[PDB]
Amino acid sequence: SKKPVALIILDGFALRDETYGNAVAQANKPNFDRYWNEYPHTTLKACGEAVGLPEGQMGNAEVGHLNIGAGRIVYQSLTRINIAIREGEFDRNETFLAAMNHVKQHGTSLHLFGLLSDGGVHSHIHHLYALLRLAAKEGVKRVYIHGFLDGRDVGPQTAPQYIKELQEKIKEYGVGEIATLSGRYYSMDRDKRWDRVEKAYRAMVYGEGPTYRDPLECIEDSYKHGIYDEFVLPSVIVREDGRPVATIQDNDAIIFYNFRPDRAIQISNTFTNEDFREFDRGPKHPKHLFFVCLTHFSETVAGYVAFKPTNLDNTIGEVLSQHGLRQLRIAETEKYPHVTFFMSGGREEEFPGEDRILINSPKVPTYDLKPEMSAYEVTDALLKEIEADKYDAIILNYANPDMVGHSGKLEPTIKAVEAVDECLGKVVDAILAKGGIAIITADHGNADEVLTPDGKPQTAHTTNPVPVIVTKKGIKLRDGGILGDLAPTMLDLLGLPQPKEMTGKSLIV
Ligand SMILES: O=C(O)[C@@H](CO)OP(=O)(O)O
Ligand SMILES: [Mn+2]
């Protein structure tokens, strides 16, 4: 039948020499290793300019998957917006101005909300300072900030530094008041866990949740309970009279300064959807909100986009489609969006011939509680499909390393890696039996450093290079490649012509 070519992405699996806090190196990976010893391999740059990001910036699932599926260096939003601020164009943004014009003409309020850190994955605090300075320039009187605490793209208990810096800028620009503070767990969920979402929503609209006069005391009090940045309960900052600093009301304007869509869609829909059934918003639910998305989130969001998106044509998925091949995209909840939407270049609709399998991730708050996650069910489901001789190409993502690594815990991250390695063996073998080829790789680093030099949790990504194995004897892979070379390599294996849009180059010599 078919000799399937499979693209296998071991999420957050990177190569790093130091083995201290390196889950990847400490894990027993017989399968992975044997493939690395017995087949052609290399490494690829998945950070900075190589993937369309500023120099020094680390990579992540969105970037990685856009680039991997695009076959070219994809220009990222972070970079694009940093440049706008640099070139004096940010202040001339018609969407920002219209938002500020709105609150001024109708005398409502402007609210700014998003991740409060310099992680650069979902946002950057510097953009917020940019919106605050622009606001002061435009003469907006009432500006309120609703902060989503990080602890995931940055240190786990670094919120206080960001809060302190923000307070300095506030005083410097002369506008803005921190209204609420919520952990990204509740305000930026992407797993459709509406109870978490509702918590954040009700804090911002009804001033419901833990109340404090001082933002810093809110943080310190939560730490005392062992609850850090990422998981802090949506809290409300109150005034001297006990009233909330500010609640979101009819006709106010909202600028969500996040530039990555997966964790922004949910809370955005909660604010803009005329009909919302996931949960009851209650009778005061603010209506007529002038809503601004920093970048395109989804068509379901009844708002405006500051920076317009641009189609990426002829991504691996499209080429496969145009040539009549049947493709499958598969992963569990946590990375389902990446193997589908991002892999297809920011498109949600399946291509003709494209099949998708979604496997539910375990019902646990944090994955360090269940390292193997749902890796076995994914593998099972995939093996059946492989056995049926249905697909010409396959795109699989094992989310374990990144998900468990984000916990900053060494032992669980090792179990995760080993769980993935076991499954990987079963998958690559079955592929080989069908006479196909596999392309083992990753989208970015993480699991390779889940502890700081000092032995403390390291919850973020790394800048280390990712691995690449092509299960085909008799060939050689060139070095110095980048993720944008993977798509071309797959088309090479499939004997399909490479489109002009893909400015990348096959790794096969
Ligand atoms: O959890 C997420 O949304 C990011 C970190 O902010 O991780 P990844 O890029 O791997 O999805
Ligand atoms: Mn991650």
Curated annotation (Swiss-Prot):
GO biological process: glucose catabolic process; glycolytic process; regulation of sporulation; sporulation resulting in formation of a cellular spore
InterPro entries for the chain: Alkaline_phosphatase_core_sf, BPG-indep_PGM_N, Metalloenzyme, PGAM_B_sf, Pgm_bpd_ind
pH dependence: Very sensitive to pH. The enzyme activity rises 25-fold between pH 6 and 8.
Positions annotated to bind Mn(2+) 1: D402, H406, H461
Effect of H124N: Decrease in activity
Influence of temperature on activity: Addition of manganese increases the thermal stability.
Class of enzymatic activity (EC top level): isomerase
Metabolic or biological pathway, per its Swiss-Prot or TrEMBL entry: Carbohydrate degradation; glycolysis; pyruvate from D-glyceraldehyde 3-phosphate: step 3/5
Protein name as annotated: 2,3-bisphosphoglycerate-independent phosphoglycerate mutase
Species of origin: Geobacillus stearothermophilus (Bacillus stearothermophilus)
